[PDB]
Amino acid sequence: KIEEGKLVIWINGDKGYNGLAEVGKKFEKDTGIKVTVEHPDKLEEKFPQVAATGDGPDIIFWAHDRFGGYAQSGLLAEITPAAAFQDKLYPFTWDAVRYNGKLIAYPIAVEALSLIYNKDLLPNPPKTWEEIPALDKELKAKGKSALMFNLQEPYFTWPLIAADGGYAFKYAAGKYDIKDVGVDNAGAKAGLTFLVDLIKNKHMNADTDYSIAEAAFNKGETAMTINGPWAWSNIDTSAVNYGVTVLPTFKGQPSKPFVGVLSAGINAASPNKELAKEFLENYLLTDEGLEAVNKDKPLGAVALKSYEEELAKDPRIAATMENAQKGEIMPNIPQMSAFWYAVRTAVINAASGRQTVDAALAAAQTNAAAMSAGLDIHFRGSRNMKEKLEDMESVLKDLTEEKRKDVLNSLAKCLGKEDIRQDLEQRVSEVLISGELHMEDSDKPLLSSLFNAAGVLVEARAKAILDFLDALLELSEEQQFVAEALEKGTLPLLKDQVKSVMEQNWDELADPEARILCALYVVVSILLELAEGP
Numbered sequence: 001k002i003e004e005g006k007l008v009i010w011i012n013g014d015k016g017y018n019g020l021a022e023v024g025k026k027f028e029k030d031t032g033i034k035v036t037v038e039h040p041d042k043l044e045e046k047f048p049q050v051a052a053t054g055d056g057p058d059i060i061f062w063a064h065d066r067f068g069g070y071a072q073s074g075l076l077a078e079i080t081p082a083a084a085f086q087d088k089l090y091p092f093t094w095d096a097v098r099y100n101g102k103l104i105a106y107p108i109a110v111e112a113l114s115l116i117y118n119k120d121l122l123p124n125p126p127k128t129w130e131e132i133p134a135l136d137k138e139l140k141a142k143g144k145s146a147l148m149f150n151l152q153e154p155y156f157t158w159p160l161i162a163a164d165g166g167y168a169f170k171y172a173a174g175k176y177d178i179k180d181v182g183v184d185n186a187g188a189k190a191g192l193t194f195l196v197d198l199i200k201n202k203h204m205n206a207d208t209d210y211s212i213a214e215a216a217f218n219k220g221e222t223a224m225t226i227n228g229p230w231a232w233s234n235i236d237t238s239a240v241n242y243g244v245t246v247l248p249t250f251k252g253q254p255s256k257p258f259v260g261v262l263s264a265g266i267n268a269a270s271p272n273k274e275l276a277k278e279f280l281e282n283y284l285l286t287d288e289g290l291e292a293v294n295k296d297k298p299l300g301a302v303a304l305k306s307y308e309e310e311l312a313k314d315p316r317i318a319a320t321m322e323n324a325q326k327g328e329i330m331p332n333i334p335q336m337s338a339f340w341y342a343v344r345t346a347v348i349n350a351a352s353g354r355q356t357v358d359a360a361l362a363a364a365q366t367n368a369a370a371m372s373a374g375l376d377i378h379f380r381g382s383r384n385m386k387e388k389l390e391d392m393e394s395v396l397k398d399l400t401e402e403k404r405k406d407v408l409n410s411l412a413k414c415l416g417k418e419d420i421r422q423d424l425e426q427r428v429s430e431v432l433i434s435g436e437l438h439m440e441d442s443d444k445p446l447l448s449s450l451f452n453a454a455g456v457l458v459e460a461r462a463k464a465i466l467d468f469l470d471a472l473l474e475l476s477e478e479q480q481f482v483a484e485a486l487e488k489g490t491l492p493l494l495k496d497q498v499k500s501v502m503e504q505n506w507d508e509l510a511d512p513e514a515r516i517l518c519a520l521y522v523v524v525s526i527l528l529e530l531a532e533g534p
């Protein structure tokens with residue numbers, strides 16, 4: 001449980017949490033209610049883990065792209081602010097927090113990555129990505145890097161990947177199409193290829209992360225970085241005389257950052273909903289409140305019309321909003337987790353060399369499609385699921401490699417084919433009762449694999465296979481993408497990413513989103529154990 005008569009608030013540690021704590025102090029000074037502001041690591045992952053059980057903070061701050069998924073998991077109070085209040089904020093900021101017609105969070109501010117550059121080492125920043133290698137040659141001689149930004153998070157590399165035609169989910173005639181993922185197209189490949197070539201020609205280093213890139217820019221070691229408004233506070237504190245401007249173009253097309261809208265959601269399990277509503281509407285989303293947070297670390301273009309009039313003078317905000325216009329506001333749908341986890345890994349592996357660009361992206365397309373279908377819960381019709389999978393894996397490890405390969409054959413054939421799966425289930429069931437094989441079993445290598453070398457049925461094996469087929473039934477379109485992952489040998493990636501998207505730790509096996517993902521995880525896990533070997 002969460003303590004009544006208090007507010008706990010989680011916000012990311014790159015944002016202005018101290019400023020927010022100031023707004024919480026003022027809230028205490030008026031209403032007598034303590035406000036604790038914490039900033040956990042892996043906040044976006046920690047919240048759904050914790051909040052699934054009925055625990056966590058009262059208010060959660062993150063960009064709006066995570067909030068649909070939280071809403072689908074029943075983790076968020078509906079927010080219902082008065083029309084009087086709604087008019088005080090920019091309409092498009094309310095759109096970003098509107099999921100399936102209901103509002104699921106208060107918008108706070110618009111964030112967009114811009115090119116930040118050291119005016120002392122680079123008076124005129126490049127208008128194109130294509131210039132940057134030459135410019136790094138020139139600067140490397142002087143003892144400086146042209147460009148350093150965080151390659152570990154795809155938020156930062158996505159503007160390049162999207163530039164020549166990458167997209168997450170196609171948006172055509174008012175609707176996103178979950179089935180149409182744009183990670184593996186000519187455009188995305190071009191953009192990612194450029195980034196890898198940058199790394200291959202020692203213009204950037206693949207292990208560069210947020211910390212490294214920030215320190216390098218703030219200590220004068222590098223001429224350009226890519227970051228968002230929150231970063232400007234530490235650049236100010238340092239010596240550097242910096243500009244904020246448009247991102248460079250790629251193939252003569254603008255970089256398209258995914259724009260986020262920092263948002264505050266109320267935990268559905270909080271006993272303090274009215275208190276939290278009051279804090280957000282009357283203390284934070286006021287000129288005094290936002291100023292407190294913005295002075296700590298800049299929010300970007302705030303959602304409160306009145307305080308944005310003050311910040312719109314700043315040329316760094318005009319730059320932020322130029323890039324915002326050139327990019328796209330992120331979708332808030334549940335499938336965004338799937339997209340981001342697929343792309344996080346494609347980019348890391350392509351940069352490191354663990355995978356070619358073409359293969360890294362082909363895998364991301366497949367895994368995103370699979371997880372996106374799994375997260376789509378609509379229009380579908382005695383033991384822990386953790387232990388069950390442990391039992392199943394145990395049994396299929398005792399098999400020989402030929403037998404493993406033969407089981408895999410039959411199960412592969414079921415993927416996407418409800419008739420074949422139904423048949424195999426009937427067969428495995430009869431065999432389990434009868435104890436013996438019939439003539440029609442003679443062309444199912446799986447049924448033979450249920451029998452040990454003595455010609456006796458191993459009941460455990462038949463039961464394991466039945467469990468697999470039950471899990472398989474729970475799945476829908478995701479089956480065809482599990483099949484792709486198996487063919488292309490990228491199951492280990494799918495497995496890993498499925499586990500991230502569950503958010504809850506696999507102890508989730510002690511909600512339809514959870515049923516489908518549990519099943520998806522079991523199917524991927526079993527197919528992998530068969531294809532790879534324990």
Ligand SMILES: OC[C@H]1O[C@H](O[C@H]2[C@H](O)[C@@H](O)[C@@H](O)O[C@@H]2CO)[C@H](O)[C@@H](O)[C@@H]1O
Nearest residue numbers: 012014063065066111153154155260340
């Ligand atoms: O890297 C993918 C990640 O990107 C976005 O996260 C941003 C966030 O928008 C900003 O508020 C800031 O903290 O930088 C983050 C990058 O680490 C998405 O909001 C997030 O869901 C996604 O995983």
